[PDB]
CSV table of C-alpha atoms in Angstrom, one decimal:
chain,number,residue,atom,x,y,z
A,1,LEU,CA,-21.7,10.1,27.0
A,2,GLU,CA,-18.3,10.8,25.6
A,3,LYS,CA,-18.1,11.7,21.9
A,4,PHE,CA,-14.7,11.7,20.2
A,5,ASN,CA,-12.9,11.2,16.9
A,6,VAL,CA,-10.6,8.6,15.6
A,7,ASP,CA,-8.4,9.6,12.6
A,8,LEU,CA,-5.7,7.4,11.0
A,9,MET,CA,-3.9,6.7,7.7
A,10,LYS,CA,-4.9,3.2,6.6
A,11,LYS,CA,-2.1,1.0,5.3
A,12,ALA,CA,-3.1,-1.4,2.4
A,13,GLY,CA,-1.6,-4.3,4.4
A,14,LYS,CA,-3.2,-3.6,7.8
A,15,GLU,CA,-6.8,-4.3,8.4
A,16,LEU,CA,-8.4,-2.1,11.1
A,17,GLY,CA,-9.3,-5.3,13.1
A,18,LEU,CA,-12.7,-4.1,14.0
A,19,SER,CA,-16.0,-6.1,13.9
A,20,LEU,CA,-19.2,-4.2,13.9
A,21,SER,CA,-22.9,-4.9,14.4
A,22,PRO,CA,-26.0,-2.7,13.7
A,23,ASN,CA,-27.0,0.0,16.3
A,24,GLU,CA,-29.9,2.5,16.4
A,25,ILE,CA,-27.5,5.4,15.9
A,26,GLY,CA,-24.7,3.7,13.9
A,27,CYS,CA,-22.4,0.8,14.1
A,28,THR,CA,-21.3,-0.7,17.4
A,29,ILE,CA,-17.8,-2.1,17.9
A,30,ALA,CA,-18.6,-5.7,18.9
A,31,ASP,CA,-15.0,-6.8,18.7
A,32,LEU,CA,-11.5,-5.4,18.3
A,33,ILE,CA,-8.2,-6.9,17.4
A,34,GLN,CA,-5.4,-5.2,19.4
A,35,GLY,CA,-2.2,-4.1,17.7
A,36,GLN,CA,-3.3,-2.9,14.3
A,37,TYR,CA,-3.3,0.9,14.8
A,38,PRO,CA,-2.2,3.1,17.7
A,39,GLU,CA,-5.1,5.5,17.1
A,40,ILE,CA,-7.4,2.6,17.7
A,41,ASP,CA,-5.6,0.9,20.6
A,42,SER,CA,-5.4,4.3,22.4
A,43,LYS,CA,-9.1,5.3,22.1
A,44,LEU,CA,-11.5,2.6,21.1
A,45,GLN,CA,-13.3,-0.1,23.2
A,46,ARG,CA,-16.0,-2.6,22.6
A,47,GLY,CA,-19.5,-1.1,22.9
A,48,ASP,CA,-18.3,2.2,21.4
A,49,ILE,CA,-20.6,3.2,18.6
A,50,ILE,CA,-19.3,4.7,15.3
A,51,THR,CA,-21.8,7.3,14.2
A,52,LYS,CA,-20.1,8.6,11.1
A,53,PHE,CA,-17.3,7.5,8.8
A,54,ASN,CA,-15.6,9.7,6.3
A,55,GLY,CA,-18.5,12.1,6.0
A,56,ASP,CA,-21.3,9.6,6.0
A,57,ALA,CA,-23.7,9.6,8.9
A,58,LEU,CA,-24.4,6.0,9.8
A,59,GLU,CA,-27.7,6.4,11.7
A,60,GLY,CA,-30.7,5.2,9.7
A,61,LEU,CA,-28.8,3.4,7.0
A,62,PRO,CA,-29.5,-0.2,5.9
A,63,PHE,CA,-28.0,-2.5,8.6
A,64,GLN,CA,-25.8,-4.1,6.0
A,65,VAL,CA,-23.6,-0.9,5.9
A,66,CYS,CA,-22.2,-1.8,9.3
A,67,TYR,CA,-21.1,-5.2,8.1
A,68,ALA,CA,-19.1,-3.6,5.2
A,69,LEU,CA,-18.2,-0.2,6.7
A,70,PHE,CA,-14.5,-0.7,6.2
A,71,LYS,CA,-14.5,-2.7,3.0
A,72,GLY,CA,-12.5,-0.8,0.5
A,73,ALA,CA,-11.1,1.5,3.2
A,74,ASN,CA,-8.0,3.3,2.0
A,75,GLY,CA,-6.0,6.4,2.8
A,76,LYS,CA,-8.0,8.7,5.1
A,77,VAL,CA,-10.0,7.0,7.8
A,78,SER,CA,-12.0,9.4,9.9
A,79,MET,CA,-14.6,8.2,12.5
A,80,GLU,CA,-16.9,10.0,14.9
A,81,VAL,CA,-17.6,7.8,18.0
A,82,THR,CA,-19.9,7.7,21.0
A,83,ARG,CA,-19.4,5.6,24.1
A,84,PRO,CA,-22.5,4.3,26.0
A,85,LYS,CA,-22.7,3.6,29.8
B,1,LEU,CA,-31.5,-0.3,-21.4
B,2,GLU,CA,-33.9,-2.8,-19.6
B,3,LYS,CA,-35.4,-2.6,-16.1
B,4,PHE,CA,-36.8,-5.7,-14.4
B,5,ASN,CA,-37.3,-7.3,-11.0
B,6,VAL,CA,-35.9,-10.5,-9.5
B,7,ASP,CA,-37.6,-12.3,-6.6
B,8,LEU,CA,-36.3,-15.5,-5.0
B,9,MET,CA,-36.5,-17.3,-1.7
B,10,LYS,CA,-33.1,-17.9,-0.1
B,11,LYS,CA,-32.4,-21.4,1.3
B,12,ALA,CA,-30.4,-21.8,4.4
B,13,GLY,CA,-26.8,-22.6,3.6
B,14,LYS,CA,-27.2,-21.7,-0.1
B,15,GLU,CA,-25.4,-18.4,-0.8
B,16,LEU,CA,-26.6,-16.4,-3.8
B,17,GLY,CA,-23.1,-16.5,-5.3
B,18,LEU,CA,-23.1,-12.9,-6.6
B,19,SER,CA,-20.1,-10.7,-6.3
B,20,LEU,CA,-20.8,-7.0,-6.5
B,21,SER,CA,-19.0,-3.7,-7.1
B,22,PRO,CA,-20.0,0.0,-6.7
B,23,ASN,CA,-22.0,1.7,-9.5
B,24,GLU,CA,-23.3,5.2,-9.9
B,25,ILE,CA,-26.9,4.0,-9.5
B,26,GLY,CA,-26.4,0.9,-7.3
B,27,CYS,CA,-24.4,-2.3,-7.1
B,28,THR,CA,-23.1,-3.9,-10.3
B,29,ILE,CA,-23.0,-7.6,-10.5
B,30,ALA,CA,-19.3,-8.1,-11.3
B,31,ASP,CA,-19.3,-11.9,-11.2
B,32,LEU,CA,-21.7,-14.7,-10.4
B,33,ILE,CA,-21.9,-18.5,-9.6
B,34,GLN,CA,-24.0,-20.4,-12.1
B,35,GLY,CA,-26.3,-23.0,-10.6
B,36,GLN,CA,-27.1,-21.4,-7.2
B,37,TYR,CA,-30.6,-20.2,-7.9
B,38,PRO,CA,-32.9,-20.7,-10.9
B,39,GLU,CA,-34.1,-17.1,-10.6
B,40,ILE,CA,-30.5,-15.9,-10.9
B,41,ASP,CA,-29.6,-18.2,-13.8
B,42,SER,CA,-32.8,-17.0,-15.5
B,43,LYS,CA,-32.6,-13.3,-15.3
B,44,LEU,CA,-29.2,-12.0,-14.1
B,45,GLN,CA,-26.0,-11.3,-16.0
B,46,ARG,CA,-22.7,-9.7,-15.3
B,47,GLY,CA,-23.0,-5.9,-15.7
B,48,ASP,CA,-26.6,-5.8,-14.4
B,49,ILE,CA,-27.1,-3.1,-11.7
B,50,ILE,CA,-29.1,-3.8,-8.6
B,51,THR,CA,-30.8,-0.5,-7.8
B,52,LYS,CA,-33.0,-1.5,-4.9
B,53,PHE,CA,-32.7,-4.4,-2.4
B,54,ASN,CA,-35.5,-5.5,-0.1
B,55,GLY,CA,-37.1,-2.0,-0.1
B,56,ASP,CA,-33.9,-0.1,0.2
B,57,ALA,CA,-32.9,2.2,-2.7
B,58,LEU,CA,-29.2,1.8,-3.2
B,59,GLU,CA,-28.3,5.0,-5.0
B,60,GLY,CA,-27.0,7.5,-2.5
B,61,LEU,CA,-25.8,4.9,0.1
B,62,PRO,CA,-22.1,4.7,1.0
B,63,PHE,CA,-20.4,2.7,-1.8
B,64,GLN,CA,-19.4,0.0,0.6
B,65,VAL,CA,-23.0,-1.2,1.0
B,66,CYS,CA,-22.4,-3.3,-2.1
B,67,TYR,CA,-19.9,-5.4,-0.2
B,68,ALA,CA,-22.4,-7.0,2.2
B,69,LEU,CA,-25.7,-6.3,0.6
B,70,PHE,CA,-26.9,-9.9,1.2
B,71,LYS,CA,-25.9,-10.4,4.8
B,72,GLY,CA,-28.8,-11.2,7.1
B,73,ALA,CA,-31.0,-11.7,4.1
B,74,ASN,CA,-33.2,-14.7,4.7
B,75,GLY,CA,-36.6,-15.5,3.2
B,76,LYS,CA,-37.7,-13.7,0.0
B,77,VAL,CA,-35.1,-11.6,-1.7
B,78,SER,CA,-36.5,-8.8,-3.8
B,79,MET,CA,-34.3,-6.9,-6.2
B,80,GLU,CA,-34.9,-4.1,-8.8
B,81,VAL,CA,-32.4,-4.3,-11.6
B,82,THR,CA,-31.3,-2.1,-14.5
B,83,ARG,CA,-29.5,-3.6,-17.6
B,84,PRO,CA,-27.4,-1.5,-19.9
B,85,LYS,CA,-27.3,-2.3,-23.7
C,1,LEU,CA,4.0,-26.2,-13.1
C,2,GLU,CA,0.7,-27.1,-11.4
C,3,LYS,CA,-2.2,-24.9,-12.4
C,4,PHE,CA,-5.4,-25.1,-10.4
C,5,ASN,CA,-8.5,-23.2,-9.2
C,6,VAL,CA,-9.6,-21.9,-5.8
C,7,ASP,CA,-13.3,-21.2,-5.4
C,8,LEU,CA,-15.1,-20.1,-2.2
C,9,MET,CA,-18.0,-18.1,-0.8
C,10,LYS,CA,-16.6,-15.1,1.0
C,11,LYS,CA,-18.1,-14.2,4.4
C,12,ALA,CA,-18.3,-10.6,5.3
C,13,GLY,CA,-16.7,-11.2,8.6
C,14,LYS,CA,-13.8,-13.4,7.4
C,15,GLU,CA,-10.9,-11.9,5.6
C,16,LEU,CA,-9.1,-14.3,3.2
C,17,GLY,CA,-5.9,-13.9,5.2
C,18,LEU,CA,-3.7,-13.6,2.1
C,19,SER,CA,-0.8,-11.1,1.5
C,20,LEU,CA,0.2,-10.5,-2.1
C,21,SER,CA,3.1,-9.0,-3.9
C,22,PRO,CA,3.6,-8.2,-7.6
C,23,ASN,CA,4.7,-10.9,-10.0
C,24,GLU,CA,5.4,-11.0,-13.7
C,25,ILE,CA,2.4,-13.1,-14.4
C,26,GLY,CA,0.1,-12.0,-11.6
C,27,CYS,CA,0.1,-11.7,-7.8
C,28,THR,CA,2.3,-13.9,-5.7
C,29,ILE,CA,1.1,-15.2,-2.3
C,30,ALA,CA,3.8,-13.8,0.0
C,31,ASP,CA,2.0,-14.7,3.2
C,32,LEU,CA,-1.0,-16.7,4.3
C,33,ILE,CA,-3.0,-16.8,7.6
C,34,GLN,CA,-4.1,-20.4,8.3
C,35,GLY,CA,-7.6,-21.1,9.5
C,36,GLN,CA,-9.7,-18.6,7.4
C,37,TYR,CA,-11.2,-20.8,4.7
C,38,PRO,CA,-10.9,-24.6,4.1
C,39,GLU,CA,-10.6,-24.0,0.3
C,40,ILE,CA,-7.5,-22.0,1.0
C,41,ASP,CA,-6.0,-24.1,3.7
C,42,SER,CA,-6.3,-27.2,1.5
C,43,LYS,CA,-4.8,-25.8,-1.7
C,44,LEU,CA,-2.7,-22.6,-1.4
C,45,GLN,CA,0.9,-22.2,-0.3
C,46,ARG,CA,3.3,-19.3,-0.3
C,47,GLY,CA,4.9,-18.7,-3.6
C,48,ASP,CA,1.8,-19.7,-5.5
C,49,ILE,CA,0.8,-17.1,-8.0
C,50,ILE,CA,-2.7,-15.9,-8.6
C,51,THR,CA,-3.1,-15.3,-12.3
C,52,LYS,CA,-6.7,-14.3,-12.5
C,53,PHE,CA,-9.5,-13.3,-10.0
C,54,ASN,CA,-13.2,-13.3,-10.8
C,55,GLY,CA,-12.7,-13.0,-14.6
C,56,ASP,CA,-9.8,-10.5,-14.6
C,57,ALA,CA,-6.4,-11.6,-15.8
C,58,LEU,CA,-3.8,-10.1,-13.5
C,59,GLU,CA,-0.8,-10.3,-15.7
C,60,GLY,CA,0.4,-6.9,-17.0
C,61,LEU,CA,-1.8,-4.8,-14.7
C,62,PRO,CA,-0.4,-1.9,-12.5
C,63,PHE,CA,1.4,-3.5,-9.6
C,64,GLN,CA,-1.0,-1.7,-7.2
C,65,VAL,CA,-3.7,-4.2,-8.2
C,66,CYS,CA,-2.0,-7.0,-6.2
C,67,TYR,CA,-2.0,-4.9,-3.1
C,68,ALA,CA,-5.8,-4.4,-3.2
C,69,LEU,CA,-6.9,-7.5,-5.1
C,70,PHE,CA,-9.3,-8.6,-2.3
C,71,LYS,CA,-10.4,-5.2,-1.1
C,72,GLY,CA,-14.2,-5.2,-1.5
C,73,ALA,CA,-14.3,-8.9,-2.1
C,74,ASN,CA,-17.7,-10.3,-1.5
C,75,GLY,CA,-19.8,-13.4,-2.4
C,76,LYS,CA,-18.1,-15.3,-5.2
C,77,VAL,CA,-14.3,-15.6,-4.9
C,78,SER,CA,-12.8,-17.5,-7.9
C,79,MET,CA,-9.0,-17.7,-8.4
C,80,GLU,CA,-6.8,-19.3,-11.1
C,81,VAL,CA,-3.4,-20.2,-9.6
C,82,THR,CA,0.0,-21.3,-10.7
C,83,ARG,CA,2.7,-22.9,-8.5
C,84,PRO,CA,6.4,-22.3,-9.3
C,85,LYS,CA,9.3,-24.7,-8.6
D,1,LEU,CA,-17.1,19.4,-16.5
D,2,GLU,CA,-13.4,20.4,-16.0
D,3,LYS,CA,-10.2,18.4,-16.8
D,4,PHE,CA,-6.9,19.2,-15.2
D,5,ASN,CA,-3.6,17.7,-14.0
D,6,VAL,CA,-2.1,17.5,-10.6
D,7,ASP,CA,1.6,16.9,-10.1
D,8,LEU,CA,3.4,16.8,-6.7
D,9,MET,CA,6.4,15.2,-5.1
D,10,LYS,CA,5.7,12.8,-2.2
D,11,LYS,CA,7.7,13.2,1.0
D,12,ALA,CA,8.7,10.1,2.9
D,13,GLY,CA,6.3,9.5,5.8
D,14,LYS,CA,3.8,12.0,4.5
D,15,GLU,CA,0.7,10.2,3.1
D,16,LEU,CA,-1.4,11.9,0.5
D,17,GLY,CA,-4.4,11.6,2.7
D,18,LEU,CA,-6.9,10.8,-0.1
D,19,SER,CA,-9.6,8.1,0.2
D,20,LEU,CA,-10.9,6.8,-3.1
D,21,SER,CA,-13.9,4.8,-4.4
D,22,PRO,CA,-14.6,3.2,-7.8
D,23,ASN,CA,-16.0,5.3,-10.6
D,24,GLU,CA,-17.0,4.5,-14.1
D,25,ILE,CA,-14.1,6.4,-15.6
D,26,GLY,CA,-11.5,6.1,-12.7
D,27,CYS,CA,-11.2,6.6,-9.0
D,28,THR,CA,-13.4,9.1,-7.2
D,29,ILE,CA,-11.9,11.1,-4.4
D,30,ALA,CA,-14.5,10.3,-1.7
D,31,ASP,CA,-12.7,12.0,1.2
D,32,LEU,CA,-9.4,13.9,1.8
D,33,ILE,CA,-7.2,15.2,4.6
D,34,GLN,CA,-6.7,19.0,4.3
D,35,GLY,CA,-3.1,20.1,5.0
D,36,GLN,CA,-1.1,17.2,3.6
D,37,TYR,CA,0.0,18.7,0.3
D,38,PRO,CA,-0.4,22.2,-1.1
D,39,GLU,CA,-1.0,20.7,-4.6
D,40,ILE,CA,-3.9,18.8,-3.1
D,41,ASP,CA,-5.3,21.7,-1.1
D,42,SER,CA,-5.0,23.8,-4.2
D,43,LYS,CA,-6.6,21.7,-6.9
D,44,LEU,CA,-8.5,18.7,-5.5
D,45,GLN,CA,-12.0,18.3,-4.1
D,46,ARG,CA,-14.3,15.5,-3.1
D,47,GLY,CA,-16.1,14.2,-6.2
D,48,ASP,CA,-13.1,14.7,-8.5
D,49,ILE,CA,-12.2,11.6,-10.5
D,50,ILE,CA,-8.6,10.5,-11.0
D,51,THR,CA,-8.6,9.1,-14.6
D,52,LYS,CA,-4.9,8.3,-14.9
D,53,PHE,CA,-2.1,7.8,-12.4
D,54,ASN,CA,1.6,7.8,-13.2
D,55,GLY,CA,1.0,6.9,-16.8
D,56,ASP,CA,-1.6,4.2,-16.1
D,57,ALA,CA,-5.1,4.9,-17.4
D,58,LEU,CA,-7.6,3.8,-14.7
D,59,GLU,CA,-10.7,3.2,-16.8
D,60,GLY,CA,-11.0,-0.5,-17.5
D,61,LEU,CA,-8.9,-1.7,-14.6
D,62,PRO,CA,-10.4,-3.9,-11.9
D,63,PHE,CA,-12.4,-1.6,-9.6
D,64,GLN,CA,-10.2,-2.6,-6.6
D,65,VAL,CA,-7.2,-0.7,-8.0
D,66,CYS,CA,-8.7,2.4,-6.4
D,67,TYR,CA,-8.0,0.9,-3.0
D,68,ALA,CA,-4.2,1.0,-3.1
D,69,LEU,CA,-3.5,3.4,-6.0
D,70,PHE,CA,-0.8,5.2,-4.1
D,71,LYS,CA,1.2,2.2,-2.7
D,72,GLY,CA,4.8,2.2,-3.7
D,73,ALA,CA,4.4,5.8,-5.1
D,74,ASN,CA,7.5,7.8,-4.3
D,75,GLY,CA,8.9,10.8,-6.1
D,76,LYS,CA,6.7,12.8,-8.4
D,77,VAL,CA,3.0,11.8,-8.4
D,78,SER,CA,1.3,12.7,-11.6
D,79,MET,CA,-2.5,12.6,-11.9
D,80,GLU,CA,-5.0,13.4,-14.6
D,81,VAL,CA,-8.4,14.5,-13.2
D,82,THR,CA,-11.9,15.1,-14.3
D,83,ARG,CA,-14.3,17.3,-12.3
D,84,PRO,CA,-18.1,17.1,-12.8
D,85,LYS,CA,-20.3,20.2,-12.5
């Protein structure tokens, strides 16, 4: 159960390229567009679960949060992630 | 200030047509499409703040929840609203 | 000097695919990703200038607005556009 | 409530590291990266509201301006800030 962090500087013109879906403990990465950020391409994989983003714990929040997690994202982007089996 | 509730039944393929933005106590209705739902044309206006959606209080949630508040919402939509003066 | 409107229902999972840059009277479409929305693919072209979005006139605003015009976009998306020569 | 100003000189390739969200009177600093700029480490905290940036008052501007407020900002960055209690 590897738990790690993903930290990057978001650029206004580059979307993170991540598609999420609700999960019991956060937001699962259901899909990922390769080539957006090196920090993502070097660490993240489908199935990994984002448990917190910029200080907010994502477990237990309305499921809609996952579908808009990165909307309005700017500057600092800090994620705590967990990878299932 | 006025506080009221809005309840409507979503029809498949008929979006609510509301565009929201973050507010201290919820999600402000920044823009709207006239003619989508009678319940909306009858009780909602730009500037109104949705404070609770389908049982979930919106104050305190990450601001981005306002960007996909209606995703996955089928059946009866229940909103609690506050209207400034 | 054709002036027209672009109206669509944004889907949480589909970005508009538009890249803007500052313009004297609004935000110019410097780049466009084909295949996102039919309303865009059937009307918009590079060089067209967005002069207003969801009730806000874009002329005279800080240039940064154009670089974040669609961040947080949800539900109703209504644009007024002008096409140069 | 406290009101103060923050002035710093951006260095090429060194992002400010601030992440903002919409606020009634400006752009709230939702998160931040410690160690980017001494001026930031010395006077800014989460919850502070940037009310004016490089001469532009932020209250009244489309809420999305908070999502790319620092793009194109090179040289001296000047901010007016309000801090709740």
